[PDB]
Amino acid sequence: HPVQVIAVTGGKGGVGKTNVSVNLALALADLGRRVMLLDAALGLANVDVLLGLTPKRTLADVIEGRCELRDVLLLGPGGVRIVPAASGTQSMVHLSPMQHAGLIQAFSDISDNLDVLVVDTAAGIGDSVVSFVRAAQEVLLVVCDEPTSITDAYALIKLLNRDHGMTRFRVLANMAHSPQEGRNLFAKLTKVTDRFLDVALQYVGVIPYDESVRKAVQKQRAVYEAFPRSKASLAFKAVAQKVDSWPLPANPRGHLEFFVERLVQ
Amino acid sequence: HPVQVIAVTGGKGGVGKTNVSVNLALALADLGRRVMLLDAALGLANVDVLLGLTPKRTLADVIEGRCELRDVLLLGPGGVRIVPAASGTQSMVHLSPMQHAGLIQAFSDISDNLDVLVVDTAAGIGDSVVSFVRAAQEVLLVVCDEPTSITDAYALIKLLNRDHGMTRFRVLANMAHSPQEGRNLFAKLTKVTDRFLDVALQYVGVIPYDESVRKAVQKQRAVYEAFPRSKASLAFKAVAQKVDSWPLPANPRGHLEFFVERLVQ
Amino acid sequence: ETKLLLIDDNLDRSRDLAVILNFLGEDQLTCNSEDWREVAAGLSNSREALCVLLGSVESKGGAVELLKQLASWDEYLPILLIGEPAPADWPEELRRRVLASLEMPPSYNKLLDSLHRAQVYREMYDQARERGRSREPNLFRSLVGTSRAIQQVRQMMQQVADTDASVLILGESGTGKEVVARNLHYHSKRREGPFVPVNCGAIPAELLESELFGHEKGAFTGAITSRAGRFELANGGTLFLDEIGDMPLPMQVKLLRVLQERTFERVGSNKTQNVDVRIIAATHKNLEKMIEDGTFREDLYYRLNVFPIEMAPLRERVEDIALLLNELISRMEHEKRGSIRFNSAAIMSLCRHDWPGNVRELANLVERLAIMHPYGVIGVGELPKKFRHV
Amino acid sequence: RETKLLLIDDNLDRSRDLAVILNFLGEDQLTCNSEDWREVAAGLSNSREALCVLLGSVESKGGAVELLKQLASWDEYLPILLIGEPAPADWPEELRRRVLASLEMPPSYNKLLDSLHRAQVYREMYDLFRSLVGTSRAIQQVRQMMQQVADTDASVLILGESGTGKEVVARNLHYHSKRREGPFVPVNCGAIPAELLESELFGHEKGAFTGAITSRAGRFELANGGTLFLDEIGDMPLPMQVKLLRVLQERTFERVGSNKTQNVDVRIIAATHKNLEKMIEDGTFREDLYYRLNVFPIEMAPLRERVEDIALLLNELISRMEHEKRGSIRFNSAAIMSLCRHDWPGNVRELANLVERLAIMHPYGVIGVGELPKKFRHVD
Amino acid sequence: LFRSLVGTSRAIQQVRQMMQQVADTDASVLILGESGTGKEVVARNLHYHSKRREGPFVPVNCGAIPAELLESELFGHEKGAFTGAITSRAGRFELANGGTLFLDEIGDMPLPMQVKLLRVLQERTFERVGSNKTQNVDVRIIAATHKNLEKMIEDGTFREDLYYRLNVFPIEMAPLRERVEDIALLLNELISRMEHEKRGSIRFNSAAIMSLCRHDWPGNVRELANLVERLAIMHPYGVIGVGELPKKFRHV
Ligand SMILES: Nc1nc2c(ncn2[C@@H]2O[C@@H]3COP(=O)(O)O[C@H]4[C@@H](O)[C@H](n5cnc6c(=O)[nH]c(N)nc65)O[C@@H]4COP(=O)(O)O[C@H]3[C@H]2O)c(=O)[nH]1
Ligand SMILES: Nc1nc2c(ncn2[C@@H]2O[C@@H]3COP(=O)(O)O[C@H]4[C@@H](O)[C@H](n5cnc6c(=O)[nH]c(N)nc65)O[C@@H]4COP(=O)(O)O[C@H]3[C@H]2O)c(=O)[nH]1
Ligand SMILES: Nc1ncnc2c1ncn2[C@@H]1O[C@H](COP(=O)(O)OP(=O)(O)CP(=O)(O)O)[C@@H](O)[C@H]1O
Ligand SMILES: Nc1ncnc2c1ncn2[C@@H]1O[C@H](COP(=O)(O)OP(=O)(O)CP(=O)(O)O)[C@@H](O)[C@H]1O
């Protein structure tokens, strides 16, 4: 009955937030879960580009109000329900938290046939990023094996812990050439957090770096369905199996979040 | 000599914006002059992390008025006066345009920049990025061969044309595995712009994918100094002349832009 | 329940350990350092083997190679050394891989604890039982303890548990207000009704009215749908208002109107609806000074102060910490997490902390050390620097 | 305790097996054989230094009767535990009683330690407490059971592990019922000898028949108008069990040698730890007595199910020390978690005995983890 | 050198005649016409033909400056004036004291801005925000707009006193679509930029010239410059005709 929402974040760009979010969406679709995929990067669209969708009406038409949220849904490849975000529209680039809410609560009306929702939160630590992170109970940080990414993810955790006090984070390593260096990356993040913060980073696995994911990107298709027999594909299948093992949210939190009425009932 | 300020943009995250800004600034510094790098990602300062420097006082202090601007000029490699900003501070991310303009005007105090100042704009097309590109005389776009990067760059171009009528742009290719790859990416982006809008974009160069950059970033040092004899370092060195010496007969006009005091007379 | 592996080349040690395993209520599969493959072939799969009890290693490649082969057989398999603990010669990964080291003659409680931990991590690492039911780090049975500081809280609980009027709660941040609200809701008449918690400080003030009452399209900027607000979701239920002093001035008169007449409105339209929402508020500051400053209105304060509830900081009930330290750990092993054991020095240092954050940061620390160094032998050293008090 | 277990067993394999079995538990054991048991047994300080005598398979000539007579000469009060074989039917009646349990080859932990506790009772008898406090869910369910039962007046059945605190629940029900003024009487059938349970419960008759050696009336007139809390009703033998059913259902008794019937109005509260419906399947328990007794079930939880209560119990236990000026020990957090993580088979009695032993060992001291006995010791 | 434009048609002849009409006096110069008609070069060439020649020219495009920020950059502010001020800098009058001030897009002036500019014109003095100092400077002001004023006052959101103060010397701008015949020559002016800025080269064929002449050209000269530079940049050294013109520019 409750809907698990996974916000794929990390602050540092290029770690693979959009691609990992799309791949997880199609992975849970293939496992047998009806999946919705929302591009929280409302200023710039990347989700519909990777999946080849070319919608005729997007979240902007929702926001300045010439339609509802039924009309913008896309039945993309892999049986996914995509909620595209506008690219280059003035009404979308910067939003007050009031309009971000006006989007968030209205997004809960379209919840008839949902099992898992994947939120592609935009890069950085902007207001929209923080609002969408707090709106999702399952926050997964994609971390690459570069100190810039390490410190930027640390900055994001510091922002979300010093200000709003959220400590749970699911660390997913990316661009790891060996299974051991992913654990090494997790140890580096753990050392930094211990020296500075008090948070509970939970290792969820490594996504190996291979040209299959990239060549799927240029072919404008998800690597899960474009190359279902690749090392990254099998490792991400295992990651999706672990994702299904994540317990469902049971209770709503004080702040705004997706599907409050689904959780409260 | 009216100060020409270059800002590095591209919208898409992880393209190399902070990295290309740091390495290019080091390139100009090693090729004469005296650069004063600034990072416009006021809440996510990655220039210091990439350079290994420890900022005693950051730009958040001068934003809050704690210290003067000249206090936060921190010497780094290559004789570069880095101006680090805060890390993990949302209050330093989304500022009112008045505060951004006050920062731009506060830069007028420094008068030791030999026509060089590199701005590292944050990912996205938010208010800070546009406010900084309007203040800059050269806007450098870094994009990678991936359709999402093309979409984000085109969205930024469309926003700038539609609201502020910017006309001249510089295109730089990053993470290109072949020399043909960057030119193909530029051709695709200019094809999209030609199909939709009226903006002229200029070629700059290409940054090949080298593991030397990864190893240098691992060493908490910029790739220009850690591995100066490398293909990426040579690419940055080549980009140095293209950036530095193209607008030799500069004619300083006037609007909301950096160092307007020097541009007037 | 499954089986156990005894790869020990010592005839006496393996024999007595097999006898002990048969005693405690589970079968065993005696093996040597090299011919364990043929014995393990008798099992259908790795699931039929719970954990292994390493003894003496005499084959080629050493105990490191033996453990590499065993992890190749099952990577998610706990390791139970007996007789000789891991010295400072093995690699760090191999050192950490060991669940625990026994000390012959085998000790009772340590052996059952090791087996219970082994089966806990075995149940945790497989793909059965599907997903569970996640809960917040502060959403545990935090009302445990023997101090005056928590007995007073429970006394005011029982005092207000038989009413339905608005309640007011005071105490520092992370002191356990959510648990108080949930307990009050569960022990009231509207137990089956919804429990909607909202904290006014987490969400900005501009949209707080929209979140509380609800809005409709065409009479609200940024409005998309004719949303029913959290007050509507609280019909027949309770609205737990945390950090109540961050409501703007008009929010106070609006709350007074909804509390007095039991009816509210939706912003943008002149329509009224009546509900029976129970208002349980919680703040972490001094309202007796905020009223004088000019932020909290008098009537709303006097309407919420019908039944106050004051918490106490963790530092003021130090002799409860151990109890919580247990009640968290059990929770973790009964949640999708393994079990952690502490040394005397670790807990003794943990009870010396001033706790600038209350129980919430204690739970955060417990979870972070559980998922940082799991199934280990964590003592005072493994604790973070701040918590290490000597 | 500090007492050891004698292992008189001719089978060398069984001897060493049981030796390591008991050395697992932490109790001190010594391996002995019939050829050398004499001098090793004489090497102990006294006959009371041994908790019991463990007899395995015996292959010595002359049978086990001679060994039993020798042990009887050694000590009259000496429990015997058979391991690996059932109770023989050819042994004399006066010798089979000393065999405490007809244990098969070394059994599970719970059965063995329950037999050891029975042997402890055997030792002590031949030689209370303010529980029901706390906010654990188990104690809350128990309290809900008391609220559901208190307004009525009928038989009450308590199920829970041995020594878990049923007496305090019986006292609570007695003081929350209409019989507050009436006497409240607890009787533990397990701790009473089988041959003397009839005299203890039904009473005494002077010169009526053989065996009348005690002069003391039974609990019938002790329990009149109040609560009779019969603990360990499983150990109730079948003839005395049907007598108890006659006393219960008819609410009346009759003195042998007369024709007058005397009425009693007592609230019966049975409490037991052995499963009763499995005993029904085995046929050694009456059908209707269970049905009448099990109308108001109180599923008393073990200490492990209400671990959060444990510390609040120690304080109360420590409080019992402060009132009587019988010492004052203070547990640190380390010992609190060390005791909380324990399984606690003898749930409350073991905790109380541990507190007493720690009090005697370290008066006015901070009880840490080092001062704890080995069985309660828990570390990282 | 400077930014140069040339023409031959009757409209630009009237433009130069009317410019020379007012070039003999120094007062507020108000320019009316559509946007992108070349008002900046008009102001700069008026200044270059005025008394001020060694003085600097300060342009202010109000469409490129936020409304709340217009007075901040124009009048100036001290270090401590509000929450966003962190440095004392002089206003744009001081930087060009003794030069020529150009103020484009006067349409969106708020009422405080209108009264402040009227005060600057009348008493020849001003004051920085968050301060009481009264400082006087001398400058020649050329204000410009893209909307016709008469309707803008008719809406009631333009102060009539400021309207009359600025409109003492009205200026009429002629959009290019009425002077298409010199566009080719005007094109030969813009290639001079390619020969003066060194950014490439571009040519126009006769068919391309006549095709361009038919185009409506709403934002005449700014759009013309943008189009020619964009065509040059997309493919330099190539021949420009009719088909390869992006869109709507091949009206034939
Ligand atoms: N000390 C401690 N033990 C904990 C805690 N959470 C879970 N447990 C233990 O884990 C058992 C299973 O919990 P579950 O899987 O959620 O399965 C639970 C759940 O489905 C439900 N349940 C029990 N208590 C609650 C509660 O307070 N809230 C909700 N929403 N469900 C509950 O009933 C089932 C059985 O509950 P129990 O009989 O209590 O059995 C519980 C209890 O023994 C905790 O925070 N502290
Ligand atoms: N999944 C899971 N979560 C658990 C469990 N036990 C506690 N929790 C979590 O801890 C919160 C507070 O538990 P509490 O202090 O016992 O406070 C509890 C307790 O007083 C009462 N309650 C809930 N279930 C039971 C139950 O089965 N028996 C009793 N006696 N009380 C219950 O309701 C209060 C609020 O319950 P919630 O709103 O669910 O809020 C619960 C829930 O979020 C459990 O076994 N499983
Ligand atoms: N798991 C992975 N393995 C290998 N390469 C990966 C990868 N995830 C991402 N990449 C690379 O990074 C590119 C960008 O990925 P993605 O679009 O997910 O980034 P992102 O969404 O984190 C940045 P932004 O938030 O700015 O859009 C991919 O097209 C590919 O080149
Ligand atoms: N030529 C190249 N070869 C390999 N990796 C490269 C690269 N250029 C950039 N990267 C990688 O891109 C990531 C980000 O680089 P960097 O931090 O220097 O700037 P950036 O501007 O791309 C980040 P953002 O987009 O978030 O501002 C790092 O993982 C870096 O190693």
Q: Write down the H helix ranges in chain D.
A: 12-24, 37-42, 65-74, 93-96, 109-126, 137-150, 166-175, 194-202, 238-250, 276-282, 287-293, 307-323, 333-340, 347-361
Q: Do C384 and A198 touch (CB under 8 A)?
A: yes
Q: Is residue B63 part of a domain?
A: no
For C231, the closest chain A residue by CA position comes to A261
E198 marked ligand binding residue: yes
**Helix, strand, coil tally for chain D in percent (to 5):** 40, 15, 45
For D338, the closest chain C residue by CA position comes to C344
Distance of residue A131 Cα from the nearest chain B Cα, in angstroms: 12
Q: What is the CA radius of gyration of chain A?
A: 17
The pair of three-digit structure tokens given for residue D179, joined into one six-digit string: 């019989």
For B18, the closest chain A residue by CA position comes to A148
Give how far Cα A130 sits from Cα of A70, A107, B191, Å.
26, 17, 35
Asked if residues C142 and C324 have their Cβ atoms less than 8 Å apart, the reply is yes
Chain B residues touching residue E85 (CB < 8 angstroms): 102
Asked if residues D121 and D262 have their Cβ atoms less than 8 Å apart, the reply is no
Sheet holding A74-76, edge to edge: A74-76, A80-83, A35-38, A116-120, A4-9, A138-144, A168-176, A200-208
Asked if residues B55 and B136 have their Cβ atoms less than 8 Å apart, the reply is no
The shortest CB-CB distance from E58 to any of B97, B101, B254 is to B254
Which residue minimizes the CA distance to atom 10 of ligand 1?
C334
Distance of residue B28 Cα from the nearest chain A Cα, in angstroms: 22
Asked if residues D67 and D86 have their Cβ atoms less than 8 Å apart, the reply is no
What's the longest Cα–Cα distance across chain A?
52
What's the longest Cα–Cα distance across chain C?
87
Question: How far is it, in rounded angstroms, from Cα C94 to Cα D203?
Answer: 69
Q: Is residue A18 part of a domain?
A: yes
Based on the structure, what is the number of domains in chain B? 1
Question: How far is it, in rounded angstroms, from Cα D283 to Cα D306?
Answer: 33
Cα of B17 vs centre of ligand 4, distance in Å, is 7
Distance from the first to the final alpha carbon of chain E: 38
Cα of C117 vs centre of ligand 2, distance in Å, is 25
The pair of three-digit structure tokens given for residue C171, joined into one six-digit string: 């105490």
Asked if residues A125 and A163 have their Cβ atoms less than 8 Å apart, the reply is no
Chains E+A touching (3+ CB pairs under 8 Å): no
Q: Parallel, antiparallel, or unpaired: how do β-strands C133-134 and C278-283 relate?
A: unpaired
The pair of three-digit structure tokens given for residue B252, joined into one six-digit string: 């300083």
Is A142 in a helix, a strand, or coil?
strand
For D21, the closest chain C residue by CA position comes to C20
Asked if residues E70 and E105 have their Cβ atoms less than 8 Å apart, the reply is no
Q: Which residue has the tokens 């003195």?
A: D255
The pair of three-digit structure tokens given for residue E158, joined into one six-digit string: 């333009």
Distance of residue A220 Cα from the nearest chain C Cα, in angstroms: 32
Chains B+E touching (3+ CB pairs under 8 Å): yes
Contacts by residues C63-67 (CB-CB < 8 Å, ≥ 24 positions apart): C63/C90, C64/C90, C64/C91, C64/C94, C66/C7, C66/C33, C67/C94, C67/C97
Angle of helix B211-218 versus helix B231-244 axis, rounded to 10: 90
Is E101 in a helix, a strand, or coil?
strand
Question: How far is it, in rounded angstroms, from Cα A181 to Cα A255?
Answer: 37
The shortest CB-CB distance from B190 to any of E58, E229, E234 is to E234
DSSP 8-state code for residue B69? G
Distance of residue E240 Cα from the nearest chain B Cα, in angstroms: 15
Which residues in chain D have their C atom more than 2.5 Å from the N of the next written residue, marking a break after them? 127
Distance of residue A37 Cα from the nearest chain B Cα, in angstroms: 16
Q: What residues contact residue E160 under an 8 Å CB cut-off, 6+ apart?
A: E153
Is D37 within 8 Å of chain C by CB? no
Q: Is residue A51 part of a domain?
A: yes
Chain C residues touching residue D343 (CB < 8 angstroms): 109, 112
Which strand (E) or helix (H) includes residue A30?
A: helix A17-31
Question: How far is it, in rounded angstroms, from Cα D213 to Cα D193?
Answer: 15
Question: How far is it, in rounded angstroms, from Cα B37 to Cα B84?
Answer: 9
Question: How far is it, in rounded angstroms, from Cα D124 to Cα D17?
Answer: 28
Cα of B148 vs centre of ligand 3, distance in Å, is 9
Mutate to test the pocket of ligand 2, among D135, D136, D137, D143 (most ligand atoms within 8 A of CB): D137
Q: Dihedral angle at the C-alpha atoms of D236, D238, D239, D242, nearest 10 degrees?
A: 90
Asked if residues D293 and D270 have their Cβ atoms less than 8 Å apart, the reply is yes
Cβ neighbour number for residue B142 with a 10 Å cutoff: 26
Q: Do A217 and B146 touch (CB under 8 A)?
A: yes
Cα of C136 vs centre of ligand 1, distance in Å, is 14
Angle of helix E39-48 versus helix E10-22 axis, rounded to 10: 50
Question: How far is it, in rounded angstroms, from Cα D78 to Cα A150?
Answer: 71
Asked if residues C49 and C2 have their Cβ atoms less than 8 Å apart, the reply is yes
Is A80 in a helix, a strand, or coil?
strand
Which residue minimizes the CA distance to atom 2 of ligand 1?
C331
Distance from the first to the final alpha carbon of chain B: 10
Q: Which of B130, B85, B117, B164 is nearest to B262 (CA)?
A: B117
The residue count for chain D: 380
Asked if residues E92 and E101 have their Cβ atoms less than 8 Å apart, the reply is yes
Q: Which of E195, E143, C41 is nearest to B249 (CA)?
A: E195
DSSP 8-state code for residue D295? T
Chains D+E touching (3+ CB pairs under 8 Å): no
Q: Is residue A164 part of a domain?
A: yes
The shortest CB-CB distance from C131 to any of A106, A165, A247 is to A247
The residue count for chain A: 265
Q: Dihedral angle at the C-alpha atoms of A49, A51, A57, A59, nearest 10 degrees?
A: -80
* Position B206, amino acid: V
Distance of residue A215 Cα from the nearest chain C Cα, in angstroms: 31
The shortest CB-CB distance from A97 to any of C136, C206, C335 is to C206
Residue pairs spanning A and B at CB distance below 8 A: 132
Paired residues of D186 in beta bridges = D229
Q: DSSP readout, A188-241? A: HHHHHHHHH---EEEEEEEEE--HHHHHHHHTTS-HHHH-TTSHHHHHHHHHHH
Question: How far is it, in rounded angstroms, from Cα D264 to Cα A136?
Answer: 68
- Which residue segment(s) compose the domain that B193 sits in? 6-38+114-264
CATH number of the domain residue A63 falls in: 3.40.50.300
Ordered by where they begin, the domains of chain E are: 10-172 (3.40.50.300), 178-234 (1.10.8.60)
Question: How far is it, in rounded angstroms, from Cα C307 to Cα C279?
Answer: 12
Q: What residues contact residue C285 under an 8 Å CB cut-off, 6+ apart?
A: C245
Q: Which of A13, A124, A141, A129 is nearest to B87 (CA)?
A: A124
Ramachandran region of residue E36, left (φ > 0), alpha (ψ -120 to 50) or beta? left
Q: Is residue A242 part of a domain?
A: yes
Chain B interface, best mutation among E233, E234, E244, E249, by max B CB count within 10 A: E233
Q: Which of A17, A8, A124 is nearest to B46 (CA)?
A: A124
Which strand (E) or helix (H) includes residue B154?
A: helix B147-164
Question: How far is it, in rounded angstroms, from Cα D170 to Cα D148?
Answer: 14
Q: What residues contact residue D76 under an 8 Å CB cut-off, 6+ apart?
A: none
Chain A residues 172-211 within an 8 A CB cutoff of chain C: 190, 194, 198-203
CA of A17, nearest ligand number: 3
Ligand 3: atom nearest CA of A121 is: 25
Is C112 within 8 Å of chain D by CB? yes
Q: What residues contact residue E192 under an 8 Å CB cut-off, 6+ apart?
A: E4
Question: How far is it, in rounded angstroms, from Cα A201 to Cα A211?
Answer: 28
Q: DSSP readout, D201-216? A: HH---SSSSTT-----
DSSP 8-state code for residue A170? E
Chain B residues touching residue E92 (CB < 8 angstroms): 254, 264
The shortest CB-CB distance from B127 to any of A94, A158, A220 is to A94
**Binding-site residues on chain A for chain B (CB distance < 8 A):** 11-15, 17-18, 41, 43-46, 49-50, 87-88, 90, 93-94, 122-127, 130, 145-148, 151-152, 154-159, 162-163, 214, 217-218, 220
- Phi and psi dihedrals of B2, rounded to 5? -60, 135
- Phi and psi dihedrals of A6, rounded to 5? -115, 110
Ligand 4: atom nearest CA of B22 is: 18
Q: Do E68 and B255 touch (CB under 8 A)?
A: no
Question: How far is it, in rounded angstroms, from Cα A123 to Cα A12?
Answer: 6
Cα of C214 vs centre of ligand 4, distance in Å, is 45
Q: Report residues whose beta carbon is within 6 angstroms of any ligand 2 atom.
A: A 250-251; C 133, 135, 139-141, 143, 179, 182-183, 186; D 137, 140
Chain B residues touching residue E234 (CB < 8 angstroms): 190, 194, 200
The pair of three-digit structure tokens given for residue E43, joined into one six-digit string: 């102001």
Cβ neighbour number for residue B191 with a 10 Å cutoff: 12
Q: Which of C10, C92, C89, C96 is nearest to C53 (CA)?
A: C10
The shortest CB-CB distance from A146 to any of B11, B93, B218 is to B218
Q: Render the burial of C189-204: b for 16+ CB within 10 Å, e for the rest.
A: ebeebbbbbbbbbbbb
Q: What residues contact residue D39 under an 8 Å CB cut-off, 6+ apart?
A: none
Ligand 1: atom nearest CA of C133 is: 16
Q: Render the burial of B94-128: b for 16+ CB within 10 Å, e for the rest.
A: bbebbbbbbbbbbbbebeebebbbbbbbbbbbbbb
Is B185 in a helix, a strand, or coil?
helix
Angle of CA points A87, A91, A94, to nearest 5°: 85
Chain C residues 148-167 within an 8 A CB cutoff of chain A: none
Cβ neighbour number for residue B7 with a 10 Å cutoff: 26
Cα of B196 vs centre of ligand 4, distance in Å, is 30
Q: What residues contact residue B76 under an 8 Å CB cut-off, 6+ apart?
A: B51, B53, B82
For C108, the closest chain D residue by CA position comes to D25
Question: How far is it, in rounded angstroms, from Cα C342 to Cα C362?
Answer: 14
* Position B80, amino acid: V
Q: Write down the H helix ranges in E27-148.
A: 39-48, 67-75, 92-95, 111-123
How many Cα atoms within 13 Å fall on the side-chain side of residue A53? 28
The shortest CB-CB distance from A152 to any of B46, B93, B127 is to B46
Is B175 in a helix, a strand, or coil?
strand
**Helix, strand, coil tally for chain A in percent (to 5):** 45, 20, 40
Q: SS3 letters for chain C?
A: CCEEEEECCCHHHHHHHHHHHHHHCCCCEEECCCCHHHHHCCCCCHHHEEEECCCCCCCCCHHHHHHHHHHHHCCCCCEEEECCCCCCCCCHHHHHHEEEEECCCCCHHHHHHHHHHHHHHHHHHCCCCCCCEECCCCCCCCCCCCCHHHHHHHHHHHHHCCCCCCEEEECCCCCCHHHHHHHHHHCCCCCCCCEEEEECCCCCCCCHHHHHCCECCCCCCCCCCCCCCHHHHCCCCEEEEECHHHCCHHHHHHHHHHHHHCEEECECCCCEEECCCEEEEEECCCHHHHHHHCCCCHHHHHHHCCCEEECCCHHHHHHHHHHHHHHHHHHHHHCCCCCCCCCHHHHHHHCCCCCCCCHHHHHHHHHHHHHHCCCCCCCCCCCCCCCCCC
Distance from the first to the final alpha carbon of chain A: 9
Q: What residues contact residue D157 under an 8 Å CB cut-off, 6+ apart?
A: D269, D270, D271, D293, D294, D295, D296, D297, D298
Question: How far is it, in rounded angstroms, from Cα B256 to Cα C4?
Answer: 76
Q: Which of D197, D171, D172 is nearest to D184 (CA)?
A: D171
Q: DSSP readout, D112-135? A: HHHHHHHHHHHHHHH-------S-
Distance from the first to the final alpha carbon of chain C: 44
Question: How far is it, in rounded angstroms, from Cα B170 to Cα B204?
Answer: 6
Paired residues of D262 in beta bridges = D253
Q: Is residue A152 part of a domain?
A: yes
Paired residues of E141 in beta bridges = E101
Distance of residue B47 Cα from the nearest chain E Cα, in angstroms: 24
Give how far Cα E181 sits from Cα of E34, E36, E208, Å.
20, 19, 14
- Phi and psi dihedrals of C335, rounded to 5? -105, -175
